[PDB]
Homo-oligomer: A and B are copies of this chain.
């Protein structure tokens, strides 16, 4: 339940808060329109994560879900976080490669399904069913990764070489980090429970900070965010 993992929740809260402040201050020295958008998007991501990590730390974002004949602690606040932060991260990537509206909607929509079905799975009372939702959510994730490689990368090359290289790195970072989430879910408290909640929380914290703060540091330090 909500106790051993408190340290990872506290560290997550602190790291997201610090990241938000760093991006906020760093963005003060920016007036370029396009550069503005990237800062706005990128700073909102850890700001949201900060509030949800704090909600979990304080116990608000935690609930008990019956399944497997047991009362299992489930941090639902994560999904509220991801619901808004994952599409924002996708928007950063899309804006970078100047994706068309159609592809953006496809990505945001698939992302919404990924998080929504993940939440349904996390709160499902029938054990076996939890994995059905996991599969559907994973399929949505694969769709997103597909678009990022066969509907994005190809266009990034048709853009400025500075944009292409920054997109390629952020793209690779996204694919590696995002793909780890379903694995942690599958092995953790929400899934088969091979890994305890304490360790599951630690894993998500490392992933979240990297996917948000790490991702943001790479993007906001790049010249790709400016139109030159």
- Closest CB-CB distance, A120 to chain B, in whole Å? 6
In the assembled complex, A171 has its CB within 8 A of some CB on chain B: no
Hey, which chain B residues are within 8 Å of A126, CB to CB?
Answer: 58-59
CA distance A129 to B54 in the complex (A): 11
Q: Can you give 21 contacting A-B residue pairs, CB < 8 Å?
A: A33-B102, A37-B100, A37-B101, A37-B105, A38-B102, A39-B102, A40-B102, A40-B105, A41-B105, A43-B106, A44-B106, A47-B113, A48-B112, A48-B113, A51-B113, A51-B117, A54-B132, A58-B124, A59-B126, A60-B120, A60-B129
The copy count of this chain in the complex is: 3
Chain B residues positioned under 8 Å from A55 (CB to CB): 120
Task: List residues of chain B with CB within 8 A of the CB of A109.
Answer: 40, 44, 47-48
A36 contacts chain B at the CB level, 8 A cutoff? yes
Instruction: Decide: B100 and A36 in contact? CB cutoff 8 A.
Output: yes
* Interface bits A3-45 vs B (CB < 8 Å: 1, else 0): 0000000000000000000000000000001101111110110
Asked if A182 CB lies within 8 Å of chain B CBs, one says no
Q: A34 — nearest CB in chain B belongs to which residue? A: B102
* In the complex, per-residue mask of A90-108: 1 if CB is within 8 Å of any chain B CB, else 0: 0000000000111101100
- The CA of A109 and the CA of B34, in the complex, are separated in Å by 17
What is the size, in residues, of chain A's interface with B at 8 Å between Cβ atoms? 38
- Determine chain A's interface SS by DSSP, over half rule: helix
Residues of B with C-beta under 8 A to A47 = 109, 113
A40 touches B117 (CB 8 A): no
Q: In the bound complex, how far is the Cα of B60 from the Cα of A123, in angstroms?
A: 9
Of all chain B residues, the one with the shortest Cβ separation from A27 is B106
Closest chain B CB from A129 CB (angstroms): 5
Q: A51-B136, A113-B48 are in contact. Are A40 and B120 (CB under 8 A)?
A: no
Q: How far is the CA of A59 from the CA of B120 in the complex (A)?
A: 11
Q: How far is the CA of A33 from the CA of B59 in the complex (A)?
A: 46
Interface presence of A84 (CB below 8 A) = yes
Q: Inside 8 A of A105's CB, which chain B residues have their CB?
A: 37, 40-41, 44
